[PDB]
Amino acid sequence: SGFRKMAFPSGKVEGCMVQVTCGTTTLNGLWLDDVVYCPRHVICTSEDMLNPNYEDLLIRKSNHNFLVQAGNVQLRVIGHSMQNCVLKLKVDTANPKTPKYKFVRIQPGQTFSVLACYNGSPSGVYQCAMRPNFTIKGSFLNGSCGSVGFNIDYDCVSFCYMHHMELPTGVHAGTDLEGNFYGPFVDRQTAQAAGTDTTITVNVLAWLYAAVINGDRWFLNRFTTTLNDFNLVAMKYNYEPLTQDHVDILGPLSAQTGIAVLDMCASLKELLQNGMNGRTILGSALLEDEFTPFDVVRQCSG
Amino acid sequence: SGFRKMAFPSGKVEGCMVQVTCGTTTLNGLWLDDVVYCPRHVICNPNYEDLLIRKSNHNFLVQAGNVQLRVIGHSMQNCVLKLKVDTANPKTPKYKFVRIQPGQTFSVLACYNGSPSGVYQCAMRPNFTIKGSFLNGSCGSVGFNIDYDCVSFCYMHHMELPTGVHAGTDLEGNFYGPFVDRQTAQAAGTDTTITVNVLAWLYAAVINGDRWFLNRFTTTLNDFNLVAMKYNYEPLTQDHVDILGPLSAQTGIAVLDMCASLKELLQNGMNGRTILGSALLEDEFTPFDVVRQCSGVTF
Ligand SMILES: O=C1N(c2cncc3ccccc23)CCC[C@]12CCNc1ccc(Cl)cc12
Ligand SMILES: O=C1N(c2cncc3ccccc23)CCC[C@]12CCNc1ccc(Cl)cc12
Ligand SMILES: [Cl-]
Structure with a gap:
């Protein structure tokens, strides 16, 4: 008996959280096998955010510009590519803690657990849902970008969300792990508003x-x-x-x-x-x- | 922005959950160093010293994932059974056993058959019960807080009261509240x-x-x-x-x-x-x- 809002055990996901730094910007990355997935806005300044040309910003970067930290170990970036709004950082070490996983795109109404992280370190786990307006009513502060949403089925972690931004109403917007935003949002500091929920x-x-x-x-x-x-x-x-x-x-x-x-x-x-x-x-x-x-x-x- | 009921990341605790079987009863155990802690009712008006003396080490089947741990000793501390195993848990985190006060909150890693199924946040009610979400097989599931890298284990699930609320002990086997681990008329006090x-x-x-x-x-x-x-x-x-x-x-x-x-x-x-x-x-x-x-x- 009893009915609680229950999150999935976050252990399989904790072993994947890393810190990604590019210049002054620091956010979270998801280290799966030899790739670190993170929001591409890690290459932007606050000014760039209004109208960033990500392909122009990314071409000016080299592997050594991206500092990836897994615990107290700095991972070496050996490649980088952009897939939609996600940056994929090829690293020289495969994560030994990589669980069995899938990248799944969810529909509104679907629920998932969020492992909120700051500086590559997990701070909390909570349960939420993809709202019909494609936002999530999360709990995210500055530095939580790159935090992921997931479900666990048997031993397989299905990654369905990566946090990218906070809208003016305090709700949150992000992408699937293929970098496609949920809803009509863009990773730009332009006038964007959550639709009526x-x-x-x-x-x-x-x-x-x-x-x-x-x-x-x-x-x-x-x-x-x-x-x-x-x-x-x-x-x-x-x-x-x-x-x-x-x-x-x-x-x-x-x-x-x-x-x-x-x-x-x-x-x-x-x-x-x-x-x-x-x-x-x-x-x-x-x-x-x-x-x-x-x-x-x-x-x-x- | 946003305010959610947030649990601590459960990873350090997941690496400790094991399945404990004795007879027909299967519940969860907490494997820390070479000891597995679990509710003493896994041996089940019970006389637990009388019931425990009749059990030998090999009556307790302990399963950590797909590996069977061998029990080399057993002792009771209040309402918790401590199963000495041959293997120290290599995933044992830095930990403390702490007794919490009513009004304090903690995370619960709900488990069935030694496998974690969910994590939720809850508070120890002033009536010493917890408004949890547990089904049959959840006994032995633990409550904890994390401070820096140290896991403070504060709760172990033992039973459900008739109103759907739950009762358990600290990791030293002392119940929170005026509850006993026995099938008798027990009710949660006015909360x-x-x-x-x-x-x-x-x-x-x-x-x-x-x-x-x-x-x-x-x-x-x-x-x-x-x-x-x-x-x-x-x-x-x-x-x-x-x-x-x-x-x-x-x-x-x-x-x-x-x-x-x-x-x-x-x-x-x-x-x-x-x-x-x-x-x-x-x-x-x-x-x-x-x-x-x-x-x-x-x-
Ligand atoms: O929303 C954003 N951030 C935040 C993200 N999540 C929770 C926050 C809680 C408080 C404060 C900022 C938060 C992090 C930095 C990037 C940013 C800044 C605002 N403009 C903007 C526009 C688009 C994109 Cl993709 C990202 C952003
Ligand atoms: O409460 C108990 N159980 C349950 C525990 N948690 C959630 C349950 C949800 C539905 C049904 C039973 C549940 C598991 C088995 C042991 C038991 C059974 C009742 N008699 C009893 C008496 C004392 C003690 Cl310590 C434990 C128990
Ligand atoms: Cl879905």
């Missing part, structure tokens, strides 16, 4: 099923709804449209609890209308949207 | 809110730009404690006020000034508003957690 509906439903599995049923009602009527109501509360894929994905939780997905949709509709009335659901006075259907099954069942 | 932690979290909200709850008012420590007692909040002591000093100096809001905000929040609610994305007053961040997260201390 919405609630991840499929995740709220999964969390309501987690509440049912943990014995919380107060919010259920005798009603059902059509998928379209649910979406018309959901849109009015800034909730993401629920698709037939979402309904299909909730099938296992529906079968386990005996509550049809459209039946749970009607409880959600009522909760949006009534609020919680001094009550909580899994120790929360707000509807939680950072647990996916897969996370609920993993934590409530194993 | 209270960790006041110093709520104040620390309110300071974290101010540091992150949330100021709506601030007011021009101040209060005495006694008037605040009369209010706090009415709302099942732990008494705030002068030590708590002293501990909040750095946050008070950083934000410019005196501790008793923040108490007047807390008094108004308790008496009137949040009024449809949130603080750090929360509609409830969060009490599982200590003043030190707020400082560490709002400064980027690394390990």
Whole structure:
């Protein structure tokens, strides 16, 4: 029993964090095999950030301009190449702590763990989700660039995020490990704003099923709804449209609890209308949207 | 920016998790140097000296990854079983066994079959329970804090109470709370809110730009404690006020000034508003957690 926001054990990722320095700039890098991955803005000054020509800035660099530090050992850079917004620093030593890994690009609503790092040293681990507006509500200070987001499946670490910037609203933007940004963001100090954020509906439903599995049923009602009527109501509360894929994905939780997905949709509709009335659901006075259907099954069942 | 419930990096602890099997019971063990620490109920009105004397070293199957460790001795210390093994854990970090106080927070590496599955942050409640997330097989999972390179082990999971909350011991086998490792009627006592932690979290909200709850008012420590007692909040002591000093100096809001905000929040609610994305007053961040997260201390 109990339902917590749980991060994956960060050990496999800690053994990959290194410090990358280029001139005055210092950020984190991910050392996997003989390559260190880091945000390409490590080659920029604060001035360059407005309209940097990365290819022009990178061509002026040599391998010895990039100082890579793994613990108290300086790694030697023997090559460098840019792939989208990530700089790939070829080093002369393969990381002996390299875990089994994949680079995966995630979709909005997906959750992942973040190992927040400063100066190549891990300071904390937390759980978060790719918001529908492609930002993450992270906890990052200056120097956290290069910190990574990941999931672990069996013994394989799936790297899905690398931190690049903080937007003016305090939310965060970054790329997959192939250097492609999530959302319409650019690694430029230009006027960029997070789009209007919405609630991840499929995740709220999964969390309501987690509440049912943990014995919380107060919010259920005798009603059902059509998928379209649910979406018309959901849109009015800034909730993401629920698709037939979402309904299909909730099938296992529906079968386990005996509550049809459209039946749970009607409880959600009522909760949006009534609020919680001094009550909580899994120790929360707000509807939680950072647990996916897969996370609920993993934590409530194993 | 951003304020998340953050756990310490779990790597130093992952290298210590092993599976301990005795009979039909399988749970987790903590392998430090040549000793594996685990709940003594793995041997299971129990007489643990009587049950333990009937077991030999080879009855305890210890598995570290895909390697079976051989047990060469066993002894009990309070509610923890200490299994002497032939091999010292080469991944043993610098460590201490520390007993924490209620209101203190720690990270829990939840494990099943000696394999870590998740890490979360939590607080030792004033009623000595933890609001954790544990399933069958999670026994032996540990709670810890990291200071520089030293892992301070403060908790070992032993059981779940009927209300879904958890109970366990320090690494010396002494239970937190009036609990016993036996199947008997046990219940968590009435819980209270960790006041110093709520104040620390309110300071974290101010540091992150949330100021709506601030007011021009101040209060005495006694008037605040009369209010706090009415709302099942732990008494705030002068030590708590002293501990909040750095946050008070950083934000410019005196501790008793923040108490007047807390008094108004308790008496009137949040009024449809949130603080750090929360509609409830969060009490599982200590003043030190707020400082560490709002400064980027690394390990
Ligand atoms: O956001 C950025 N940073 C930060 C990143 N993450 C959390 C921060 C918390 C406080 C302060 C700065 C933070 C690090 C330095 C680069 C920068 C600076 C602002 N302009 C900018 C624009 C685009 C890009 Cl890709 C990076 C940046
Ligand atoms: O609490 C216990 N368990 C559990 C521990 N943690 C999360 C559980 C989630 C669901 C079910 C059982 C769980 C594991 C097995 C031992 C046990 C069983 C009940 N009787 C009992 C009495 C004393 C002691 Cl110390 C331990 C226990
Ligand atoms: Cl995905």
